[PDB]
């Protein structure tokens, strides 16, 4: 029924400094030929407490995809620290990879992300204002959280 199947997502350049870009090698299998485009999005959850703090880091149109296995690297620039609340800067958050086909979300790959200081002084005594230039982003690549949604392939 579902025209697109997501085979795997490989998290590249992990870990990396907070300001360094996101890298993802995406594999998907096309069961049938699609006449429309497959839109991929990288969404950073700036704050667990509110959807106000979400940042679409990148969005890519892929198509017209013919039947068969396909692969691509999905790169995205780092989130904006000025849009991220202080209380959510250090610790755990979520990055999302979504795919729509005719405005309809059918796949959502989510990762837990660990933003921590590597410096002994900073990790033991974190500042009031987070120093983003010293935070390391460590994605939980071994725990991909995948959600499929029932969509219309008209």
């Amino acid at each position: 029924m579902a025209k697109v199947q997501v085979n795997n997502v490989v998290v590249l350049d992990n870990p990396s400094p907070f300001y360094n870009p996101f890298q993802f090698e995406i594999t998907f299998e096309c069961i049938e030929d699609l006449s429309e485009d497959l839109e991929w999005k990288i969404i950073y959850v700036g704050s667990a407490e509110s959807e106000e703090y979400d940042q679409v880091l990148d969005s890519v149109l892929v198509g017209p995809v013919p039947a068969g296995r396909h692969m691509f690297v999905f790169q995205a620039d780092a989130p904006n620290p000025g849009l991220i609340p202080d209380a959510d800067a250090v610790g755990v958050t979520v990055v999302l990879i979504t795919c729509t086909y005719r405005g309809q979300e059918f796949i959502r790959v989510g990762y837990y992300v660990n933003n921590e200081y590597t410096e002994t002084e900073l990790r033991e005594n974190p500042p009031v204002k987070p120093d983003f230039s010293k935070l390391q982003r460590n994605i939980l690549a071994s725990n991909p959280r995948v959600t499929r949604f029932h969509i219309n392939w008209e």
Binding site: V92, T93, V94, L96, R145, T147, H150
Partner: peptide, 24 residues
């Protein structure tokens, strides 16, 4: 971290009205 924060992050991960599994 508190439970409410893990629950909030769980919700963001799964979205709404889908089936969630670890792995592909």
């Amino acid at each position: 971290s508190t439970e409410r924060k893990w629950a909030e992050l769980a919700r963001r991960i799964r979205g709404a009205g889908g089936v969630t599994l670890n792995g592909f």
